[PDB]
Swiss-Prot record, chain A:
It comes from Saccharomyces cerevisiae (strain ATCC 204508 / S288c) (Baker's yeast). Belongs to the MCM family. Present with 166 molecules/cell in log phase SD medium. Early fractionation of eukaryotic MCM proteins yielded a variety of dimeric, trimeric and tetrameric complexes with unclear biological significance. Specifically a MCM467 subcomplex is shown to have in vitro helicase activity which is inhibited by the MCM2 subunit. The MCM2-7 hexamer is the proposed physiological active complex. The chain holds residues 616 to 692 of 845 of the full protein. ATP 2 binds at R72. It is found in: Cytoplasm; Nucleus. This is DNA replication licensing factor MCM7. Acts as a component of the MCM2-7 complex (MCM complex) which is the putative replicative helicase essential for 'once per cell cycle' DNA replication initiation and elongation in eukaryotic cells. Core component of CDC45-MCM-GINS (CMG) helicase, the molecular machine that unwinds template DNA during replication, and around which the replisome is built. Component of the MCM2-7 complex. The complex forms a toroidal hexameric ring with the proposed subunit order MCM2-MCM6-MCM4-MCM7-MCM3-MCM5; loaded onto DNA, forms a head-head double hexamer. Interacts with CSM1 and MCM10. The gene is MCM7.
From Swiss-Prot, chain B:
It comes from the Eukaryota. Present with 35100 molecules/cell in log phase SD medium. Early fractionation of eukaryotic MCM proteins yielded a variety of dimeric, trimeric and tetrameric complexes with unclear biological significance. The MCM2-7 hexamer is the proposed physiological active complex. Signal peptide: none annotated. It is found in: Nucleus. The lineage of its organism: Eukaryota, Fungi, Dikarya, Ascomycota, Saccharomycotina. This is DNA replication licensing factor MCM3. It comes from Saccharomyces cerevisiae (strain ATCC 204508 / S288c) (Baker's yeast). The gene is MCM3. Belongs to the MCM family. Acts as a component of the MCM2-7 complex (MCM complex) which is the putative replicative helicase essential for 'once per cell cycle' DNA replication initiation and elongation in eukaryotic cells. The active ATPase sites in the MCM2-7 ring are formed through the interaction surfaces of two neighboring subunits such that a critical structure of a conserved arginine finger motif is provided in trans relative to the ATP-binding site of the Walker A box of the adjacent subunit. The six ATPase active sites, however, are likely to contribute differentially to the complex helicase activity. Component of the MCM2-7 complex. The complex forms a toroidal hexameric ring with the proposed subunit order MCM2-MCM6-MCM4-MCM7-MCM3-MCM5; loaded onto DNA, forms a head-head double hexamer. Interacts with CSM1.
Length: 77, 59
C-alpha cells in the first residue's frame, strides 16, 4: 500500500499488466469457441458428484458446514 | 484545579487572528501538496504491526 503512493503503478520487475482494451478483444475472440465435452470427462464427474452427495448428507446440522447440496451445484461445475 | 481553570476563563470572557488565518489556509491549497519520501516508510511499517498485534488485545 505504501508503494501505491510512491508511484502510480504497483508491480515491480516480475509482471507487466494487461491493458483492458487489448484484454477484452482476447476475451471476445474467446467468446466464439463453444467447446464440446468428451466421454472420458463424463466418467470423471459422475463419481465425483457421488463424492459430494455422500459427505454433504452425513452432517444435517447447523454447524460450520452448510446444510444441503443441490443438483444445481453439478449444473454449475 | 480544573474547576479553577474553568472559573477565571468564563469570568474574563464576559468582559494571530481569525481573518489572518483563512488567508494562510487557502494559500496552502494550490501550491503546498507534498510527496512521500523513503523516511516515511520505515517508522510506520514498524508502527502499524504494533497496531495489529497489541491494540487488538485492548480494543
Amino acid at each position: 500500500v505504501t508503494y501505491v503512493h510512491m508511484h502510480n503503478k504497483q508491480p515491480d520487475l516480475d509482471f507487466t499488466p494487461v491493458e483492458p482494451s487489448k484484454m477484452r478483444e482476447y476475451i471476445a475472440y474467446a467468446k466464439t469457441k463453444r467447446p464440446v465435452m468428451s466421454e472420458a470427462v463424463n466418467d470423471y464427474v459422475v463419481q465425483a458428484y457421488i463424492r459430494l452427495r455422500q459427505d454433504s448428507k452425513r452432517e444435517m446440522d447447523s454447524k460450520f458446514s452448510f446444510g444441503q447440496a443441490t443438483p444445481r451445484t453439478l449444473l454449475g461445475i | 484545579i480544573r474547576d479553577r481553570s474553568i472559573s477565571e476563563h468564563v469570568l474574563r470572557t464576559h468582559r494571530v487572528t481569525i481573518p489572518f488565518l483563512r488567508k494562510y489556509v487557502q494559500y496552502a491549497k494550490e501550491r503546498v501538496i507534498p510527496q512521500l519520501t523513503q523516511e516515511a516508510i520505515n517508522v510506520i511499517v514498524k508502527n502499524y504491526t504494533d497496531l495489529r498485534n497489541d491494540d487488538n488485545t485492548k480494543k
